[PDB]
Amino acid sequence: QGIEQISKVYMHLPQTDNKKKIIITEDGEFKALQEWILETDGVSLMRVLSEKDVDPVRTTSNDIVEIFTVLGIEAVRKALERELYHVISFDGSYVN
Amino acid sequence: DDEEETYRLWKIRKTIMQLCHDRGYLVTQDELDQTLEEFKAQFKPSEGRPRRTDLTVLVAHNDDPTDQMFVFFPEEPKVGIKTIKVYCQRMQEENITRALIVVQQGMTPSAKQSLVDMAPKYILEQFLQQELLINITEHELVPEHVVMTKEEVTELLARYKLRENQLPRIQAGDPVARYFGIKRGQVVKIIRPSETAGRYITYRLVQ
Amino acid sequence: LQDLGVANGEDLKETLTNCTEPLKAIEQFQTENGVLLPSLQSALPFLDLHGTPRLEFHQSVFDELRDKLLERVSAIASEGKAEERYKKLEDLLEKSFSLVKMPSLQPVVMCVMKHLPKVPEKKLKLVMADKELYRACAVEVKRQIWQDNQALFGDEVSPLLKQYILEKESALFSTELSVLHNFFSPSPKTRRQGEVVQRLTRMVGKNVKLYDMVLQFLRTLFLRTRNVHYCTLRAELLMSLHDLDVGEICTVDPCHKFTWCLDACIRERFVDSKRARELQGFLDGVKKGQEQVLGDLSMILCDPFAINTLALSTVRHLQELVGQETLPRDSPDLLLLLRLLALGQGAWDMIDSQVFKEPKMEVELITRFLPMLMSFLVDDYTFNVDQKLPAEEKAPVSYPNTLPESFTKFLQEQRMACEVGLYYVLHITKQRNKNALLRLLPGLVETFGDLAFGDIFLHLLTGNLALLADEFALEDFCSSLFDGFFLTASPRKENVHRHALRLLIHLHPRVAPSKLEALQKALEPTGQSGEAVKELYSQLGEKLEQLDHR
Amino acid sequence: KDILCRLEHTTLRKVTANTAIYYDPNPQSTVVAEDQEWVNVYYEMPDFDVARISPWLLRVELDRKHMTDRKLTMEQIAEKINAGFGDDLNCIFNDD
Amino acid sequence: DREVLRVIFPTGDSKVVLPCNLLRMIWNAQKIFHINPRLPSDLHPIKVVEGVKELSKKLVIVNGDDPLSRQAQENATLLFNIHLRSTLCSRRMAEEF
């Protein structure tokens, strides 16, 4: 069972609000729900997105070439922007 | 297995109806909201009825009713030349000129040549079954893509005093480009949210 | 008020008339007609002092208490032990029907009659007799009179059926042609959404006797009119009963499953292998002894959209036999299509006289007609390919526009061959195979029963004829259909003349000047059609003046 | 965790404790006494042994721990093997 | 505008970078003209609305009058116009500033 090129999958609840499931409740207030996420080693984005009971919207990769092959050029534009924003802003520094 | 197969074919059906809706082809709301059990009731397929010929469907353009589109489902693993010829003969019979065909897990390289060579008189596009399992356009990363009519492209190039080659490019083999079925020379307006201006509109040339 | 021992206004004026103490008499009348609680007889002066009359709090409690009385009518319908609750409702009925004349207790009693399966029929008779009660009465009251006597059912379905035929005639004669839409686009479930058949379902509800009543009345008018509209309305009424999931008809009617299958057939306008097998097994359940519903079953098949479905299915089978390299004898689904269409066309004849048999197909019709049609398509596609090849020959292979006289003979003598040929012509008109169109059009001068002049085919041929709009400027394309075909039966039936006149009314700007002028003066009202041709000819003359400015 | 097991790649070697190629020429008999019981349970009815089955035997042990953790059962491994190799390999499995 | 911000910022982060510090400019306006917040003001709400409208007309990133230039003008200054309308709304203008 399982999709190849997936050697390990870590299951956890993110306590940081960035990855939390942020919704807008009926009162119009932001609420950050705590929901399980899985982070893996090795990428096969087309297969995992095709899986059942998987969020096909929020599911993303850190491999930009996978994104380009599976999603496109604007998608990999946005993904690359988020990735290098992450690697820059990890240490607390800020850039425009 | 039968259960996962009917779920898969229902999901693919949902996907290509959403695709045809995005391409301007007229599809009713119920088939766009076709539940899984609705797929069960309308048609379990373990040679009961996975007649892939029966899942094939015709659709018409919202503003150009003579412009119509078939979508086909070949039941063989790798598509052969003769079933392509059957589909083009069907197309000749119904006068259709656009027809994208899904494939089970692959397509024969002979068919790769046999679709491109006769392309200028009959438009055909090959989709892997894995690709249509999800609608990529609903992903959070892809922004909103809309094809521009040539009038709009002329207005755009007249506004900015631009030539077509000066715009940024998008490859015809891109997943969203194949999703919208845009040939070389088309222009796609991409509308995306931005954290500095709120909204941002860019334009990409299909080359 | 006297029905339960209480006074009225005339008794009040008697109590005042010829009295030495009218004021005390008035006070006594007020005491006798007040609300009988002990707290009120002291509070009435006090609340009167405020400028609020006694009638005002009476009005408030009147609204409140009749709301609760209606609530409790529904409750006793749904609450209490059965004998006690029905006894309570019938007793309250006897109390309340004396005030149905008054404007308060009509709908309360109408609900009570709604929740009892049977009533003494004096009150149902008064409900039909009085127009106000005939309006405000609940659905099951009307059901009970209809279930007890058919007079009101006929009296009210006659105008509704007249309105259904009004809609059918008006829609079939409408003068719009486009690549966008036609009037046969709505599915039968789309057409059931009109309030005529849905209200007929409400009038029938879940009752089988009223189902038999609508069946017989549609049977009578279908037997006198020879028109498929009543057939379509039976199909619509049955599937509207199914839209409500009426188990009283759907599970017992052997026709319900088969009409449900036909609904999907008409929605796709084809009999595909799944529903084909379903309908074929349904037909093969016809065995001697229990064939009584064959009349109703084929009578369902008569719907114009069903004729469209079966005929285009046969054309599609003819066309797909070409690419398969197969003879028409090896086409089971095609034989099923023809069997169903022959049954449906013979439905009316079964209504006059029940003749239970699976008809046998004509020999030359399978062995000589369909192979000729396949040969026509083969010649068409050979000509197309020879055009598309690089340098076939000088003046490439002329597609045969010839008429093998067997084809025209079957267009004019063999009913089913006529209809499938008509829709063959229609389908090539959608594909605009002009050489095939003028191959198969001539020979239609003679037709069996003027099926080539029916409203359905003529409407659809008009709908296809805006595709080749510029060809009307040429005299021959219109003359092949007007001077050659329509005028062969234009003065015979009203529908043909009306169809030609609407076709020329829509497409007046593109027809040549002398051509349309001659068409009007030749298609003038000839004396076999009434106000329809009069208004269409008035429009024809006005638009011919407009063309004189063209 | 069920979805995690569904997508994380598991191969046969993950769930196997060991294997051994015996000989066992008579398939009715077994070299291992514990094997003979349930082998006889699968041999009162002939399963592709009326003709001479190959007189070799490949006997594998599956770890109970990894089988329970990955939600794997005995039969579906045999189904996967038969799908991979057709009927080229006759596969029997002990009752759970 | 609130719905537009909601779809643009699904994470609910209100911190955003923009050209003009409206709050600091309002504070400077308060302390230049000696605004007494304890007393009623003499500013029409309608004047606030028309002033923000004509100001947003004056702030131009792309110039032109055809639909393309106007749409680009709206999109370029969408977020700043939202921030300006929210900050200089007649409610907060009459209550707290």
Swiss-Prot record, chain C:
A molecular function GO annotation: RNA binding
Main subcellular location: nucleus
Pfam families reported in the protein's UniProt record: COBRA1
Cross-referenced InterPro entries: COBRA1
Compartments, record wording: Nucleus
N6-acetyllysine PTM sites in chain numbering: K515
Tissue distribution: Widely expressed. Expressed in heart, brain, lung, placenta, liver, skeletal muscle, kidney and pancreas.
Keywords for this protein: Acetylation, Nucleus, Phosphoprotein, Repressor, RNA-binding, Transcription, Transcription regulation
GO biological process: cell population proliferation; negative regulation of stem cell differentiation; negative regulation of transcription elongation by RNA polymerase II; stem cell differentiation
Any one cellular-component term (Gene Ontology): nucleus
Oligomeric form and interacting partners: The NELF complex is composed of NELFA, NELFB, NELFCD (isoform NELF-C or isoform NELF-D) and NELFE; the N-terminus of NELFB binds to the NELFA:NELFCD subcomplex. Binds RNA which may help to stabilize the NELF complex on nucleic acid. Interacts with the first BRCT repeat of BRCA1. Interacts with KIAA1191. Interacts with NELFE.
Family under the similarity heading: Belongs to the NELF-B family.
Function recorded in the entry: Essential component of the NELF complex, a complex that negatively regulates the elongation of transcription by RNA polymerase II. The NELF complex, which acts via an association with the DSIF complex and causes transcriptional pausing, is counteracted by the P-TEFb kinase complex. May be able to induce chromatin unfolding. Essential for early embryogenesis; plays an important role in maintaining the undifferentiated state of embryonic stem cells (ESCs) by preventing unscheduled expression of developmental genes.
Protein name as it appears in the record: Negative elongation factor B
Gene of this entry: NELFB
